[PDB]
Write a protein that binds this ligand. Structure first.
Ligand code: HEC
Length: 108
């Protein structure tokens, strides 16, 4: 994909309604169905401490950045075949840009 910085204020609303059910962003934050996302950018996949991932998410070994995250969030199951989740993706590019703008700051 091709990320363009958007609205982190809209990104925070999108995280609450589309991600927060399964994830947290705070340092030391708890894992829910999905892993806590603190430090996700600039780190390889399957490395949230204390979270047990599928072989698919571990074997992907993607170094998370703004662009591959955008591609991933479009359809996680297409990007990482074998990943297990009741999530189909964030289809609108504007949403992905807004979400990632917020996420880059929230997980820092
Ligand atoms: C529950 C229905 C979920 C929603 C909604 C979202 N995600 Fe998720 N995510 C979930 C699980 C169970 C997992 C782990 C899957 C596995 O194969 O083990 C994940 C994983 C991620 C990751 C990868 C983390 C890593 O360390 O590699 C990211 C980056 C991620 N999820 C982000 C994310 C965002 C931003 C969401 C809202 C757009 C979101 N997920 C929705 C479960 C669920």
């Amino acid at each position: 994909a091709e990320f363009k910085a958007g609205s982190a204020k809209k990104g925070a609303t999108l995280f609450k309604t589309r991600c927060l059910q399964c994830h947290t962003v705070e340092k030391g934050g708890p894992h829910k169905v999905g892993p806590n996302l603190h430090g996700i950018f600039g780190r390889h996949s399957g490395q949230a401490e204390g979270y047990s991932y599928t072989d698919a998410n571990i074997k992907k070994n993607v170094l998370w950045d703004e662009n591959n995250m955008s591609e991933y969030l479009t359809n996680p199951k297409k990007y990482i075949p074998g990943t297990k989740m009741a999530f189909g993706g964030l289809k609108k590019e504007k949403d992905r840009n807004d979400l990632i703008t917020y996420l880059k700051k929230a997980t820092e």
